[PDB]
Amino acid sequence: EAMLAKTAADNRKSAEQVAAAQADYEKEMAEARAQASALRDEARAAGRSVVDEKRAQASG
Amino acid sequence: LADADAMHAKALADAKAESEKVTEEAKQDSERIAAQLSEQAGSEAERIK
């Protein structure tokens, strides 16, 4: 009976384990996309600051 | 369960590898954007002068 219960628990745990491994896969995909979007955002923001201060220097 | 363990291991390895690769690609994109934007700023300075 313990083996039967353990087999049922193993089936359920492996089902949720494949589900959670997949979910972690999309989670880290979204994480990498978020960091890429960040990197791009702060890079372009620094570029905005640099170009704006260059415009100010040119005006002066 | 063994197959799920192998799937978890391979999926984690591929996730780490792909995440690293795409993170560095996004980096390189960021530096290229910054370089071309500094070039645009220099062109704007030349236009102002």
Q: What is the resolution of this structure in A?
A: 2.6
Cα distances from B49 to residues A6, A21, A48, A49, A55, in angstroms, run 79, 58, 20, 20, 10
Q: Tell me how the structure was determined.
A: cryo-EM
Q: Which residues of B touch A (CB under 8 A)?
A: 1, 4, 7-8, 11-12, 15, 18-19, 22-23, 25-27, 29-31, 33-34, 37-38, 40-42, 44-45, 48-49
Burial class of residue B1 (count of CB atoms within 10 Å of its CB; 0-12, 13-18, 19+)? exposed
Sign of the Cα pseudo-torsion (B15, B17, B23, B25, in order)? negative
Q: Do B37 and A51 touch (CB under 8 A)?
A: yes
Q: Do B4 and A58 touch (CB under 8 A)?
A: no
Burial class of residue B47 (count of CB atoms within 10 Å of its CB; 0-12, 13-18, 19+)? exposed
Which token pair is A15? 């089902």
Angle subtended at Cα A35 by Cα B17 and Cα B23, rounded to the nearest 5 degrees: 30
Q: Are B20 and A29 in contact (CB under 8 A)?
A: no
Q: Are B46 and A56 in contact (CB under 8 A)?
A: no
